[PDB]
Structure 1
């Protein structure tokens, strides 16, 4: 039976028997390549005290399906629109949360919204360089950033 300890803004905390469970909205993430650069983003993330390398991402809002949320986050975080293709999904950490992330590829990007606001910093970077900087200890990845880098190396070269 699920017993709620905390009902919040993007999460709830529940106990289910002996299990501590964090309910969390589903998410999307968008992989985009242009001229050999991947579209990363960075923001301060208070949970970790730093700004990891991510790709455009966010929570699915009421009424949206993953494709629509992916469109919205690409536009809101980077001012771009593209033709989106669903790739795959993953549970971020199924040992404690139900957050599920739906990953899309974006092609044929166009700037639809003009951008020196760095709430969300747009970081175009070759994925090879992102991986090298991470191997040198100079940047951290989110799961979405790492998935973007690995997907590129696997399928986009």
Structure 2
């Protein structure tokens, strides 16, 4: 029942009667704790003009299931591997997009890929979740949904 206005690289824009719909690939995100610090990442995000606090995340590529994508994103963004457990999923904004995010826990982390130079295209930000939440409350950092989900999951289940 949909008409396409635009077919792009990570999204399509469609109209469905009165509804404006953005089709988007599904995503993964990985919650990881070590020594009381959560593994956050930051990168410049042109859609928002700032670098919010996120957790390792990205799009599921052709051929992959969510577990495999989660492994890949953890390795590509942080150089780590771990034992991954599926937690839950969510639709990021079901009033306009079908993007669905599958969230995993990672335990028993090991460095498998060295962090080249001082590369900060993706910045690795180990931070206690309590400190992330305080910084946010102070107006000092913004959250993505994945970062906030990580912080809340920690406070609910990992203390």
| Fold equivalence (TM over 0.5) | yes
Any idea what SS the aligned residue of 1:74 has? Answer: helix
Any idea what SS the aligned residue of 1:77 has? Answer: helix
Deviation at 1:66, TM superposition (A): 0.0
Deviation at 1:102, TM superposition (A): 0.1
**Counterparts of 1:93 and 1:156 in 2: how far apart (Å)?**
27
Give the TM-score, by structure 2 length: 0.99
Give the TM-score, by structure 1 length: 1.00
Deviation at 1:18, TM superposition (A): 0.2
**Counterparts of 1:4 and 1:56 in 2: how far apart (Å)?**
31
Any idea what SS the aligned residue of 2:28 has? Answer: strand
How many residues of Structure 1 are paired with residues of Structure 2 in the alignment? 157
Deviation at 1:97, TM superposition (A): 0.0
Q: Which runs of 4+ in 1 moved over 3 A?
A: none
Deviation at 1:141, TM superposition (A): 0.0
Q: Note the alpha carbon deviations across 1:19-52, whole angstroms, 9 max, x for none.
A: 0000000000000000000000000000000000
- Alignment root-mean-square deviation, CA: 0.1
Any idea what SS the aligned residue of 1:94 has? Answer: coil
Deviation at 1:3, TM superposition (A): 0.1
Q: Note the alpha carbon deviations across 1:73-123, whole angstroms, 9 max, x for none.
A: 000000000000000000000000000000000000000000000000000
Partner of 1:109: 109
